[PDB]
Amino acid sequence: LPPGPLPLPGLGNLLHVDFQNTPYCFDQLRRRFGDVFSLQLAWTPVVVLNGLAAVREALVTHGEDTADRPPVPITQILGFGPRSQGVFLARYGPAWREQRRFSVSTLRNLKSLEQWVTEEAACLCAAFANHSGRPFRPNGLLDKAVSNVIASLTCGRRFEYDDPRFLRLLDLAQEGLKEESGFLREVLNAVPVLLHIPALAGKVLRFQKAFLTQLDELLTEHRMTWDPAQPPRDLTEAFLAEMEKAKGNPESSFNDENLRIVVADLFSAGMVTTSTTLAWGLLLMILHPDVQRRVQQEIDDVIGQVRRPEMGDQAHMPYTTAVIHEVQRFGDIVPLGVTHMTSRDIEVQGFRIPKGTTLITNLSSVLKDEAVWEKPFRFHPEHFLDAQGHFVKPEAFLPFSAGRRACLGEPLARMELFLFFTSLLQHFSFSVPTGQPRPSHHGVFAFLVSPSPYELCAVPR
């Protein structure tokens, strides 16, 4: 029932959409066909969901029937199997629930973690300071800091900012991540041209393949040293202990094939999502020093200029919390979220969506819904503050989406964000370089929006 552009025969309408700037075209279609609209990519049926109401209805109200994930043809090059699907793209079932339940459970046992982020935050602060006067791109440093946190939890160790193996991981990660979006990936899935045609099959997802084999290196290295008599200190070990405990049946999702994919899912996700947000954070603090100052004093009032920040401070810091949430909302890191699929027929905003329809939850249309925020497209921290200035998180705040598939990294993310953000502003003040012009608000698109290239200088307080 949703209204869609007519699909030209053969390729469908995958021409009509620009996959190197997707969020734009989905907005340009939302203005003719309205809030809910549907497009055909070749055989595949799709129904883009825009605005809070339409999203919440599918993911929460009809959540039990939209938790599944649509199949990806091009995954074959990675070598995915029903046996090993990881978490991120695994189909709604026991294999997914096992790894999902294992993931969040294992992170919790691994206060202790709280201290570890601040430790890493130091090494970051230092790296920052070591360029006191000169302008520099903080994107790369943040990437390293955040990556060491998720590395600890999963690989048991942290890496030096100079380590070649480490920097190669980071690079492949960001490049692999771009691969997720584009023209070639979408059209490959649709038609069997990918198969038995090495020329394209090789080029697409290439970096991710290079990324995984650099992970397998780290894993086999890590596996070789795993001593069973020692309780797990990292997820890899914890997983290995499960592979031992569950050697009984080959049906279990705990296997060598899954280990690399699961660890990849968590390791990669922690690496870029938080780090990009922190890049947006610093940016919005140099283009809005007025907001930067207010936070900076609040820090001094509660935390102080001398002791490292602790999660227990967030409670007593309404502005810093509202800014961060605003940074995420405005940042709009993951515009179209992650593709969903209907397990059965459902109804959204009147229209009726048939089973097997790929769903695209446009979180941007929610994070910036006109009927919710007072100043949607402007950086307005007061979107999370009431009359007496107490923090309040609105429903429409869904940077982590919602439903059974909602981000299982939110707790970690929340922890990482607040601790890194405050630790930075506490010991530093960030301004645009004197000579340099105003850096753009707008963000480049590579599946996830990132702050357009910019520089800043960091000076102690």
Ligand code: HEM
């Ligand atoms: C600012 C930080 C982050 C943002 C904005 C974010 C956002 C998202 C979004 C939009 C989804 C899709 C939800 C859906 O399918 O409806 C998702 C899923 C997921 N995220 Fe994140 N995430 C962040 C951090 C993390 C971290 C730190 C981890 C792991 C350490 C992580 C791991 C995952 C996993 C495994 C899934 C898939 C879960 C499933 O499919 O059941 N994320 N996240």
Ligand SMILES: CSc1ccc2c(c1)N(CC[C@H]1CCCCN1C)c1ccccc1S2
């Ligand atoms: C919120 S959607 C999101 C957010 C951050 C990342 C990614 C997706 N992925 C996908 C995970 C991928 C990892 C390999 C095994 C199969 N799985 C699905 C990614 C892909 C490639 C490089 C970096 C990353 S980090």
Ligand code: NA
């Ligand atoms: Na993929």
